Amino acid sequence: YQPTPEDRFTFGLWTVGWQGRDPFGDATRRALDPVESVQRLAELGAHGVTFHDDDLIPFGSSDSEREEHVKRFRQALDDTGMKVPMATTNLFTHPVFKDGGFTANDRDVRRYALRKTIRNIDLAVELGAETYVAWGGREGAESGGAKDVRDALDRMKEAFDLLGEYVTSQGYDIRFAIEPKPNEPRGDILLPTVGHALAFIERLERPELYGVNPEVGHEQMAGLNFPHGIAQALWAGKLFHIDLNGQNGIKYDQDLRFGAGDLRAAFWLVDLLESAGYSGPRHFDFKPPRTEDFDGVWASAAGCMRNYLILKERAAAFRADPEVQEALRASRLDELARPTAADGLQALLDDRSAFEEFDVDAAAARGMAFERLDQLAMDHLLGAR
Amino acid sequence: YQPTPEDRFTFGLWTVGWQGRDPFGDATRRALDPVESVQRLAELGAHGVTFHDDDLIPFGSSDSEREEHVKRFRQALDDTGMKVPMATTNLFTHPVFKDGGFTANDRDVRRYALRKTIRNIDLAVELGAETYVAWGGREGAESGGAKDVRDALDRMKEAFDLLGEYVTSQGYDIRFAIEPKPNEPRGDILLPTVGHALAFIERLERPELYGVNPEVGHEQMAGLNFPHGIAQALWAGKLFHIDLNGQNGIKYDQDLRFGAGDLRAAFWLVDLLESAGYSGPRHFDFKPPRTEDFDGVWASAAGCMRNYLILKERAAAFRADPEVQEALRASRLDELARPTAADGLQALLDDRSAFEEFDVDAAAARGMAFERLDQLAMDHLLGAR
Amino acid sequence: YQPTPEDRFTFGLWTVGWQGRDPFGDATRRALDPVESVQRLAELGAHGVTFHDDDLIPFGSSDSEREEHVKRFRQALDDTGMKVPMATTNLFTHPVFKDGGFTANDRDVRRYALRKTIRNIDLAVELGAETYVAWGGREGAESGGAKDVRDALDRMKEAFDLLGEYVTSQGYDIRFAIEPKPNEPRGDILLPTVGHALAFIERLERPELYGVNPEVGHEQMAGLNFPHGIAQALWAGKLFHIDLNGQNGIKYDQDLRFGAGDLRAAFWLVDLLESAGYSGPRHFDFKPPRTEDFDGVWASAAGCMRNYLILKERAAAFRADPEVQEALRASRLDELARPTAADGLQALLDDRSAFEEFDVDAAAARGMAFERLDQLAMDHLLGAR
Amino acid sequence: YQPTPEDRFTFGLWTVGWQGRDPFGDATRRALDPVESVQRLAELGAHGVTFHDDDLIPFGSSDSEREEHVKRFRQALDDTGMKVPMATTNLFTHPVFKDGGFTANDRDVRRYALRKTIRNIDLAVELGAETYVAWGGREGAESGGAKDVRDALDRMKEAFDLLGEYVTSQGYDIRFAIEPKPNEPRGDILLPTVGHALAFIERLERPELYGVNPEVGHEQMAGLNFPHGIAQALWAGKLFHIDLNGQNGIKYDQDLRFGAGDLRAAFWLVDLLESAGYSGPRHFDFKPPRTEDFDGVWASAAGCMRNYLILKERAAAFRADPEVQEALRASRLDELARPTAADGLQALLDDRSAFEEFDVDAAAARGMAFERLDQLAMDHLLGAR
């Protein structure tokens, strides 16, 4: 199950580059040069990398150092054929961001956040990114009086409307993807789930420029079904990008390699991405555990891609099995896809078979046959089929 | 802290009427006649009651029994001055609903669900309800292959579009409020949070007919900040109705009396409802614990209203305290309410004070003074102020 | 992967016999006669069944009806060769139990709970059970003032000490297994996890008569690692019995068939049970979803056993693979099993290589190689090995 | 509500000294000198401070620097009258600890962990500590094959037995308190709750030397009732020390000031500590949010003490109110405290009023009156009484 660049696997610089500093411990690994990560990921079969501004150009770099970091990076992409499909801004590490970027209470900080963002959109375009992610990890509060959330959503809409004005003014071909997270590092983060981010987008001045970048572990931090939230984002036409990883339930954001965590959810997510024909990058936002040395980093990144390809093969064998197609009909999945009342309202109202003569007891007695379908899915996942 | 009808407190018939049957135990209380609940709630100071169809007219009642249940009920409302501001449909108890109402896999059941719904909308209008709630507690799945969620959202949009066609065709003055819940009784429920329900509404044919009816305990079942989700529903103009209760964290849906559960969240929710001027019903969707007899039922319903009125007084004393107004300025809440860039994009781009000459270290060093503000809020809640 | 009676798979009568009544819905299946469940489970390859008193003899049965229910049951066990390795008492359904059995505030109810229990211990012995489970699902509270927990633990120790006096007085060969659950149906249940139940046992008059019956879904309702809690129960010598099922995270108690829920946890649990040589029953405490008819009931019960046998084969292939044995040495699992200081305290204190001359930087730089080990485990589980 | 040293309030050096580095951000505050924290806490009314070795003497300090840090510290305690009732070891920050201290897979690291521990026990004794805490935050795993937990509990018992040998050999008057935490920074931490730590202690060679140091936010990270776990630790005689703080549900470890988080749980915890007569330190293990400057640090530490004193006054007014004493009798709290069967087993067995003539329906019909009791508790907490 060997990845190639045609599988569209991507990685953040900050993922394999995570030094292992956690809330309770020092770094366990030395910093990697971005050039070295590009080379090593290209050897494992990835298609490309992504970056925050500050991963690529150290905070406070002069214009001359900037251009040098960029030139070196561009050389490694040329040398390897790696692409950069997505970029984002760090509006969370520097102390100035301690109360947020776009929704900081201090107006001066909010203007600074927008300026730092627009400078990186230009860079992203130059390097060919098609998607610009926004994770507002510092937007929110630990206490109720610290943040009026209606005012905060006004400031958040204002920031995103200004960015959509900027891109359209420049004539760039870049769309935005907002990434929800329910908590951590703030006590509560604004737009905490995919549903909250989708609903927010519909109030922007140009909603067609914005979609979501959901992350597996983030929706599971709220105990939600990740494949169900992705189906809603697909239904709305707003799955612009995705972050793949693993999480063991409701606790701190673990960012385990993809396939770790909830393995059945991983299976039904691949099933959905492949059957809806998602064609964006398969991006891993993960942290090799701090127990690992460099060898363990590259083994963890390789397992991300391996697990995706194994689950892809098992979900395709599941949907291709005639015995599964028969079970799906037995459970009336075909009937869920037909209109309830294509005949229209008046006809429904006049239909005695829908009410006055509907035999509720006979309908109630029909089993759904879901457990037999779910064991076929289990047998397929385990290769016991 | 005595409620009057002017406080707009309402209760479902199923709340004080809960017989105490749980997944592991039999009923501990006899059934109440709806007429008796109307009388007892009017004595405690409530403004009105709400109902599912099946709470008021027993499932399978003939037209003659129907009209009799309605006449008796109408007499008790006349006798007490109680109103009925909201009604909803039971699409969850009868076995026919075991796979959903509007998104059941069986198309016949979906048509039946719409017919049962429209019959109750007529009744609701006749009794004067202004809001019709929809809680799809059976819409969802315990396993991944049982429900294609894109098809299920197609069927859910189809159902709600047909209901909006019906109400507009009849010329009724009734709006719909969808109530999210993340799980229970299904393994995962579709539109599991306020954000998911808001985003869904924006894809209906006539979005202006639909809002949300969030419930305190339901968002806390996903570990989310209830006051933050209500602020987003207010920001979108979609807070049509609300269900008030208490929940102790992420576990089964407890439906404790309001003020039980997370008491600080209760305080910041009342603070928000009163400061945004929400004018809908203050409705309690709660279950007096099955340990209680009838005396304990009416004591629990009275505590719902008492706790709301105490929290209202403390939140108003908080916002009225000059020392709190000073702390809010100290924490720059005034600055969060001002536009970040009313000057426009070009001016922001030309402003050297926003970037090239912005002193990040001086801005970073400014404390937010949030803990002093939050202890003032604590002192106010406890009356230690 | 066909089960036989030698695999020691057992089922509660209440599991396949669950009629599908949930907090929001009516029964979707008719009641099964215990005789019919015995016959059907024996056909699928189970080894035996378990019962609460009230599953086998309807509450309030006269002595004559009692003896008749027992005789019929005994005939079906004779006809099939099924055993009864475990029995328990229903101290949760009847309204009298609304505040608990052994820790009800009313003393009369507590004495009644003990009498109902002892009557069923006699029956259990007669039918050959070796383990008597105690699940105190009504022991706990929805509010802080309702239960003094020190007094409640006094009453709980008193009840269990009286039962251990009874069994020793009668000379029965039966041990007790307490089953923890953190909540539901009470707001909080006493002894909410395996750790709490283990610690409690050590304060009983004869601790050797009591162990734990942990359930997969119950520890995961507190977000805990089920295999880690079982290793602690094994370490203490107190794994008397186990309840196998599946749960999707922190929410209501789902009781899905075994292998559903957290599939990797299922794998590491089988790995542990088989490698520590657990020889008790493999008992399924699960509920076929209420979407199912009778066909779906027996398919769900068969999948419990199938999934156990598949995971058993994959965990055995994992531990048998030379490449895995090499990885375990690479990650120093062999060193975890050696004493840290068999040399004794004084020698440790005099050892300069343990402190004064210990090279912390060289030790820190050694990678643990855990991600490579965990991908081997993944490949084994998926059959991609 | 002004604290004095007689209230026994203590703080870790690492609490007010937290620089605000989180998994996503840099420090927002400069480091404090321990001498300055001693002085500032003594001014706010605290009784004493606690320390990890590495908070007081920077890692890798020579013997001469060691003695200097100690002398300066001792001078500040002399100058202020502050005591040091508890000390602990840092076995979590340095990279060498990435797989644990006492249960690291590498045996050399385990011996190093014990040596670093024993050196700090000597210091703790010299400074007068009576309790030595052990928080094994690095003991556990992110993956199932990385840690055999039976071997890991063998190594953990071996470490604690060696420490109990050491203290008894030296004739020190110091006891150990193990602090549970369910996760973070490891995926799962061993002995994850108070129940797990209590049960473990009973397998040590000298159990009387060891108790628990439970933390409010840690049990709530597993969704458990903190006051119920403290009642069990009190019931076992093992509440040696306690860590007070606040947490908003199941998510990362927030360490908010005490009274933040779950305020009703805070009330019932103070009620319990004061009514059982706990006489150890009231220690705050909290982090002033990184939004704060130094002024906000000392305001947050003062609110910890203020909130404790307010809750103490409200819980004492609750238990002193004659109307509450009457409600407690109405809910049969007096009957929970009487033996169920002081008459003995034989008498219970011969008592027809316990079974054959027990009127279950009359007992079932008695209401518990818990909601009226719980609203009295609410009125008391809010000062509405």
Ligand SMILES: O=C(CO)[C@@H](O)[C@H](O)CO
């Ligand atoms: O998810 C996280 C942090 O939780 C980030 O890696 C975003 O994806 C990009 O800033």
Ligand SMILES: O=C(CO)[C@@H](O)[C@H](O)CO
């Ligand atoms: O919330 C619930 C069930 O959880 C219902 O009472 C809805 O409010 C109306 O059907």
Ligand SMILES: O=C(CO)[C@@H](O)[C@H](O)CO
């Ligand atoms: O676990 C449960 C209910 O949650 C019971 O089936 C016990 O196992 C036996 O009473």
Ligand SMILES: O=C(CO)[C@@H](O)[C@H](O)CO
């Ligand atoms: O609780 C924590 C970290 O979560 C520590 O402060 C311990 O109390 C002492 O090491």
Ligand SMILES: [Mn+2]
């Ligand atoms: Mn993440």
Ligand SMILES: [Mn+2]
């Ligand atoms: Mn991400």
Ligand SMILES: [Mn+2]
């Ligand atoms: Mn509810």
Ligand SMILES: [Mn+2]
């Ligand atoms: Mn509701």
Ligand SMILES: [Mn+2]
């Ligand atoms: Mn269960």
Ligand SMILES: [Mn+2]
């Ligand atoms: Mn069980």
Ligand SMILES: [Mn+2]
């Ligand atoms: Mn903590």
Ligand SMILES: [Mn+2]
């Ligand atoms: Mn602590």
